[PDB]
């Protein structure tokens, strides 16, 4: 069948923004297969061979100072321009999380069980989840899936709590996120 070698070429123009358009850094990187070969860093002002394979291109492009000028200016004409274009629906995007608490398994009480705090469909990805037992924060026995990207500009995450639930116990999951004025709390009574 089709058994030919494959040859991949990638080009990435990376605009890095710190404190908005206050501090900007342009990274133009060329990757052959799995190997970055040549790179432009606006902090440096010129191309640098990341590997020997990309040295011809670095020398070749650096020899043209007018191209270097345009590249340095790109921080404004390109990076800062695009930031402003999409800022409204990207940097300012905020989607409130849906928070649900439920026992992992159906267990009679007084037996080990995981308390699952489901936090799904939120944006952006910055988030803080906290477990409480009867008003007291519990930092031990917390297993997390970490931040999960859905691919549709939403994130989800599961923060689980190792517990042996007693009748009368109150468990609270507190969620903090840029999309809410105050912490979201959800209770589960054993």
């Amino acid at each position: 069948g089709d058994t030919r070698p494959r040859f991949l070429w990638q080009l990435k123009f990376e605009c890095h923004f710190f404190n908005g358009t206050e501090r900007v850094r342009l990274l133009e990187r060329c990757i052959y297969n799995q190997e970055e070969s040549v790179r432009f860093d606006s902090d440096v002002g010129e191309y640098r061979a990341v590997t020997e394979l990309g040295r011809p291109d670095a020398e070749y492009w650096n020899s043209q100072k007018d191209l270097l000028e345009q590249r340095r200016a790109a921080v404004d004409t390109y990076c800062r321009h695009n930031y402003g274009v999409g800022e409204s629906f990207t940097v300012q995007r905020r989607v409130e999380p849906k928070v649900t608490v439920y026992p992992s398994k159906t267990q009679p009480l007084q037996h080990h069980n995981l308390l699952v705090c489901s936090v799904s469909g939120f944006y952006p990805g910055s988030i803080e989840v906290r477990w409480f037992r009867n008003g007291q924060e519990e930092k031990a026995g917390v297993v997390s899936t970490g931040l999960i990207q859905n691919g549709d500009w939403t994130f989800q995450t599961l923060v689980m709590l190792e517990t042996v639930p007693r009748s009368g116990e109150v468990y609270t999951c507190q969620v903090e996120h840029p999309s809410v004025t105050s912490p979201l709390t959800v209770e589960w009574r054993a």
Binding site: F13, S118, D152
Partner: protein
Amino acid sequence: EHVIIQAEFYLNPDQSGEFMFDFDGDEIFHVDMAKKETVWRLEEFGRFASFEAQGALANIAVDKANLEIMTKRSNYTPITNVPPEVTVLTNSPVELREPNVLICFIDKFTPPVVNVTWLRNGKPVTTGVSETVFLPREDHLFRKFHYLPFLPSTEDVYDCRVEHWGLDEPLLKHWEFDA
């Protein structure tokens, strides 16, 4: 910190090209090479911004030429097939008979060529399903999402069959509800 990435790639001999913009790991839009038009990830995006898709093709042209120059300079050193990690999950906790979406998450792979089909009870599904193009990674591997809207039931099992040159055989990632 925020990061906007203009990501392009070209693959030989497949002759596959891609042009997309990325924001903090999410796709803003990509250019459909065949139709020569901008496709926004979220359609709302197209109401606040525009892109001359035609320019993306000029770039891909240069990329293709550069690839062949590079291919030769490397004495025809081919890419190593790195098989993907595959994960199936729902975009929300499952409630029997309550609308949901299965997410086939394909990750950490290269080259950006893959074959994905959903199987319900051993049979392909096409109705309602959608996918994303290949998302770029900092290690220069790729990321990809496949979706399948569905009503959870105790009577159905699902599989996300993934084909990639890095695999010795098709990879099935099972998902089913358990009472």
